[PDB]
Amino acid sequence: RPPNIVLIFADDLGYGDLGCYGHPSSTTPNLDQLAAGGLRFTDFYVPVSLGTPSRAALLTGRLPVRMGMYPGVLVPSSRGGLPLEEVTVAEVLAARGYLTGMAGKWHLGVGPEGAFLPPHQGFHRFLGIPYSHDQGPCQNLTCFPPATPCDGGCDQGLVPIPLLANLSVEAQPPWLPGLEARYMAFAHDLMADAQRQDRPFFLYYASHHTHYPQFSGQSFAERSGRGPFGDSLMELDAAVGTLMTAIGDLGLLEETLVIFTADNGPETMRMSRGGCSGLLRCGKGTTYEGGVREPALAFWPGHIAPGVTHELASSLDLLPTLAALAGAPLPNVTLDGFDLSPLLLGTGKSPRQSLFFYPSYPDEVRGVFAVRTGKYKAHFFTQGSAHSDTTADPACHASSSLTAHEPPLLYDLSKDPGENYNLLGATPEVLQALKQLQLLKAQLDAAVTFGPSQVARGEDPALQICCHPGCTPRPACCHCP
Amino acid sequence: RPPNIVLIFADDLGYGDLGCYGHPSSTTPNLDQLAAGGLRFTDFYVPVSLGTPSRAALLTGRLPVRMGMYPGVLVPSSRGGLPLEEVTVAEVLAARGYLTGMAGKWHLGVGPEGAFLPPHQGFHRFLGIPYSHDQGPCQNLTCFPPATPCDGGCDQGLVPIPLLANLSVEAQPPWLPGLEARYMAFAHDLMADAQRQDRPFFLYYASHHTHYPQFSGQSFAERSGRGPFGDSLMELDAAVGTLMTAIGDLGLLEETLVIFTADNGPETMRMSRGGCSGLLRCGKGTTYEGGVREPALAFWPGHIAPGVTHELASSLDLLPTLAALAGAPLPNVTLDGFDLSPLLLGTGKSPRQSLFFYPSYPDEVRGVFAVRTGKYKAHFFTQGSAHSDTTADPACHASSSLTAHEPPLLYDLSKDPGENYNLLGATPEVLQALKQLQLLKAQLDAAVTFGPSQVARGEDPALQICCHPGCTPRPACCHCP
Ligand SMILES: *[C@H]1O[C@H](CO)[C@@H](O[C@@H]2O[C@H](CO)[C@@H](O)[C@H](O)[C@H]2NC(C)=O)[C@H](O)[C@H]1NC(C)=O
Ligand SMILES: *[C@H]1O[C@H](CO)[C@@H](O[C@@H]2O[C@H](CO)[C@@H](O)[C@H](O)[C@H]2NC(C)=O)[C@H](O)[C@H]1NC(C)=O
Ligand SMILES: [Mg+2]
Ligand SMILES: [Mg+2]
């Protein structure tokens, strides 16, 4: 009965990059066709616009500050990770008899002997990199075949990037141009095996596209009309087409729910090798709309009618929506998301009315930075980010320091999705929204306790993964292509 | 044999406003469905981003400086207008036996006894306003029924706005909320009458949406989810649906070519009551992409296959493309556009490789401001505009004075459609494009002679249209609702 679920999650992909979201030069045919036969969201969000906190909110349905996933992101030597008491979507579904698998980027911790890796958090199978593909030296890696080097060199002084098969190093570093093929092969096996055992599968595909540095296989190099950022987006798009064909071939089209979203806004610091937030303001690292609002598509033939919704939805609602769909019971913890099945099935409206946004570096004195309720969004604090540097808007830059706003900056997103015109710079409708927004912020700030910081547990270079354990000299000896 | 042609031309509508171009809250179902069954252009342009010069380029296929359509726009007391020796598309088709008609905004001149009005430039029928609907006092007009006044008051000290039937005042001022119905009725009659006489029709629908001040009939007031700008865009969209139904009802779907575009970018000076250029920079009044690049759709069942093109196209190419399609010979003058039928019919590529952009206020010493060839665009001079004021980008503002750039600012629009990263801030590909761009500008500037300025012929208040001729006191006595 339960449907097969495929969750595709891109990296550093903006609201404005898909062809079907208006980009003028992107090449995204498979995703455009998924949009045309399914539900496209205009108002779907993540609560925090950084890699780690966003992946944690997705898998647990819980605001990242509750389990210490702040500040910033995790690094290869981090001691901390997503606590093992947290229940993930993979576990909710595993206990209901799903065969669960994950391909790609984890970024939720490695820890002493890989205690925080995926196999310990409900995934039966796992093929991927445990953090971002730029958190290790890349001046000698090939990003585009036959021999175009990755640009800029990535993070120095670390072990090369490891490709893992569950808990074992399969390659270090992997060959970037062939990663996609590896991941499609893995996905195909997971599907077929689940079919054979008469059980539903759950595929978590956490792509490295479109994070820096850009790369692709040889079928896409110089073929998109948007340079390296495009080639890489085009490969991600072809991966979606490949998964849809594999779902075709096995006669599972009407029994599989396919969801596509992305973790956080574009890193405009990469300039034309980085994403695009379209009409929205600023990008990764900020609580402006270009940082937190992402593309989101839902496709399930004969169940989800083709259309466009403007209803409020969050990555936080994915656990409870998927549980409900699979007839799995919810964990016994406070959750911050809701079941969106009525909306998906067209029998009801989204139950979500409000959204809460935390910054990259949160603190308990300040609390939530921005809150949206209906079409209104208030900003109590504003701050630019180096990840959103280089565009013409000065509020996006790292030089825009942390600034308090009281009364808050107040925008009507139905008319000013670009956050250009502060309404408080009077009306009874506005005043009532203002008072609601202020009370929602004070209620959440008083009820939420911050879990102890995982990131502040520190770093220990002995925690880096090494293909040749015991090796010397570290870290350059750790390798095995 | 010749197909029936319907040309829909919007006013002050941005690249980012249609639902099918990515807007998150616009309501444009009929246009989205036309896009889904026809050709959508990502790179279609006008040469000058102001009302008058743009309408002149559209109807003649000639750069506006050749016949003196500069500087700025025409006003109700202007003595000048589009010269009668110019040949328009309506004339090209009339001489081939088309029954031609125009509904809406003209803005190409009135003159002594209406010598410059449409009936003198090849249109058989004409129902509309001879200039923009804000060039006359509007503090007492109703913009939205039952009694919501137009915001801000419009231009003062002038005659109220006249609605004309050929050369006669039908109302002054008209009732804004019922204008659409008038225009649809007129369009329906034109179609039917042409059918009855066994002849092809040419409908030129120059909408007032989405120019300030916004207005609509009662079916759309407060129904879009984007306020007044949305309500007005929603009515324009319903007008398109109505014309498509009328084409249905008469069995002419496969014999009619329908084209939709807009004259110039958004007036962001109206803030949330103005348009949106999406990812593009700046708006009306500038030579940045948000000023000159517009939405553009072509629909003709069983002739134009549904798709998306990135090929170069201009409003300048419409005359020669429509002539060719109707088997009508081209006027004997130098034209600046090309026939795009191969592209439309999918048997060839666009013949256009370059585009030339003039500012609102051009001069013969400076010449062309910006030139695009392939994916490269050079800016030799840059300037902001009060029509593009109020956004966060400072280059769009009226305080950004006229600035020369030598060497020019150079952008690769396939990767940086947002014009953020100057390539000259080295490569052999870049250097060759640079030299090409410089030579194209110098060739055009040396070959083009500016026609004598029509706008500089001055104003004469006796040229204002008056419903009660001889009247006193002018101009308030001129009226007849
Ligand atoms: C690591 O672990 C999983 C299982 O723990 C490995 O896979 C299994 O895959 C083969 C066929 O592909 C089956 O015969 C077994 O029954 C599978 N076990 C389960 C529980 O599914 C796999 O080699 C590794 N993960 C991957 C795909 O890298
Ligand atoms: C002004 O002029 C046109 C014609 O010059 C008027 O219309 C004609 O319309 C009626 C039916 O609608 C026909 O009987 C005539 O044959 C038409 N003439 C032509 C040349 O088409 C019309 O009333 C006015 N224009 C509009 C529609 O306002
Ligand atoms: Mg990310
Ligand atoms: Mg205009």
PDB file of N, CA and C in Angstrom, chain A residues 50 103 110 224 371 382 389:
ATOM      1  N   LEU A  50      21.819  27.483   5.607  1.00  0.00           N
ATOM      2  CA  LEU A  50      23.185  26.929   5.573  1.00  0.00           C
ATOM      3  C   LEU A  50      23.024  25.388   5.470  1.00  0.00           C
ATOM      4  N   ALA A 103      22.117   8.362  -1.307  1.00  0.00           N
ATOM      5  CA  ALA A 103      23.243   8.676  -2.177  1.00  0.00           C
ATOM      6  C   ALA A 103      23.610  10.154  -1.983  1.00  0.00           C
ATOM      7  N   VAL A 110      30.486  13.049  11.389  1.00  0.00           N
ATOM      8  CA  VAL A 110      31.261  11.814  11.134  1.00  0.00           C
ATOM      9  C   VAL A 110      31.543  11.220  12.516  1.00  0.00           C
ATOM     10  N   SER A 224      25.569  22.974 -21.733  1.00  0.00           N
ATOM     11  CA  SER A 224      24.438  23.797 -21.278  1.00  0.00           C
ATOM     12  C   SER A 224      24.671  25.175 -21.913  1.00  0.00           C
ATOM     13  N   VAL A 371       9.948  36.366  11.010  1.00  0.00           N
ATOM     14  CA  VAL A 371       8.738  35.546  11.095  1.00  0.00           C
ATOM     15  C   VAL A 371       7.767  35.887   9.948  1.00  0.00           C
ATOM     16  N   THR A 382      18.513  42.119  11.036  1.00  0.00           N
ATOM     17  CA  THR A 382      18.936  41.889   9.631  1.00  0.00           C
ATOM     18  C   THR A 382      20.454  41.770   9.607  1.00  0.00           C
ATOM     19  N   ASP A 389      27.913  37.891  -0.921  1.00  0.00           N
ATOM     20  CA  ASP A 389      28.639  39.056  -1.410  1.00  0.00           C
ATOM     21  C   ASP A 389      28.551  39.135  -2.932  1.00  0.00           C
TER      22      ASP A 389
END
